[PDB]
Amino acid sequence: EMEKEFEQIDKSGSWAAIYQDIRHEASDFPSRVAKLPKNKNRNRYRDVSPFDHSRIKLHQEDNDYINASLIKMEEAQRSYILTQGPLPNTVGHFWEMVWEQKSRGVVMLNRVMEKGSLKCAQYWPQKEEKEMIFEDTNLKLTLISEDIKSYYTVRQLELENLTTQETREILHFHYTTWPDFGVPESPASFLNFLFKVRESGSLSPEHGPVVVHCSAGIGRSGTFCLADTCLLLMDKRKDPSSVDIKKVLLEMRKFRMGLIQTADQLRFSYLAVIEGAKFIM
Numbered sequence: 001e002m003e004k005e006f007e008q009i010d011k012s013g014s015w016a017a018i019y020q021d022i023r024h025e026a027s028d029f030p031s032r033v034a035k036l037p038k039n040k041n042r043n044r045y046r047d048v049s050p051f052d053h054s055r056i057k058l059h060q061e062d063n064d065y066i067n068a069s070l071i072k073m074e075e076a077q078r079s080y081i082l083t084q085g086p087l088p089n090t091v092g093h094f095w096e097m098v099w100e101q102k103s104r105g106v107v108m109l110n111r112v113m114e115k116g117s118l119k120c121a122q123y124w125p126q127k128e129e130k131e132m133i134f135e136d137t138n139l140k141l142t143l144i145s146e147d148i149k150s151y152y153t154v155r156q157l158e159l160e161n162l163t164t165q166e167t168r169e170i171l172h173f174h175y176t177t178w179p180d181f182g183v184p185e186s187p188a189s190f191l192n193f194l195f196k197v198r199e200s201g202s203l204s205p206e207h208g209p210v211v212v213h214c215s216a217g218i219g220r221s222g223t224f225c226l227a228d229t230c231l232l233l234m235d236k237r238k239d240p241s242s243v244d245i246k247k248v249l250l251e252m253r254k255f256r257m258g259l260i261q262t263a264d265q266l267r268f269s270y271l272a273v274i275e276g277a278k279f280i281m
């Protein structure tokens with residue numbers, strides 16, 4: 001059981017060591033499309049690339065590339081698209097992907113500015129009466145409503161395909177209180193946020209996969225889909241303590257490199273799952 005595994009690693013301070021075994025065991029697949037010179041300005045970080053086998057393809061004949069990966073967790077019946085925070089030049093591609101994949105929710109785990117630098121383009125409207133038009137992908141985005149709470153904001157957005165005049169409602173779940181350095185002290189507000197995303201229907205199989213991002217789409221984004229998947233597995237299995245968080249992480253790393261960036265994020269993931277396990281129990 002992971003509660004006991006937690007105490008062992010914690011009392012022995014072995015988090016950096018566990019984390020290095022995961023780094024060592026992790027899959028390595030080609031990412032040739034990401035490294036093409038025509039895609040250099042579609043990547044926020046030169047060392048964070050989608051694998052060719054799991055990459056999301058845009059339906060535009062010109063250049064189908066976006067820094068985004070489909071993570072398919074077969075046993076849990078959960079899919080996620082993990083992507084980087086959009087760049088000034090990829091905001092149109094981002095919304096095209098949301099449209100093409102029939103996503104119902106976008107989960108954002110960063111602030112636009114952190115540590116005095118921009119981590120993400122402002123890719124949604126700030127006011128009802130000032131909609132955004134993405135001329136390159138022929139989409140219009142309107143803010144419908146905004147519910148600001150202490151730890152997160154939920155926004156209802158309307159996405160309109162200007163080509164076909166179809167409209168969809170998108171929910172934007174913005175976790176606003178992840179600290180600039182390290183991880184939250186307590187996983188309580190992160191769990192509350194994760195249960196709010198679940199309650200919306202955004203993670204349900206009747207929609208396309210949820211889009212999850214932070215700045216690179218590997219660290220905080222990783223923690224989100226690791227916690228969700230592990231809790232769902234502990235609710236599906238005969239024996240919930242058969243769920244090994246290290247195994248689940250390695251399965252997710254087949255689909256996108258580098259998920260969980262630090263030993264601190266790994267510790268936090270255990271804590272979130274343990275406490276989320278305490279919940280529902």
Ligand SMILES: CNCc1cccc(Cl)c1
Nearest residue numbers: 231234235240276277280
């Ligand atoms: C939802 N996962 C928590 C858990 C742990 C152990 C047993 C059950 Cl039914 C659920």
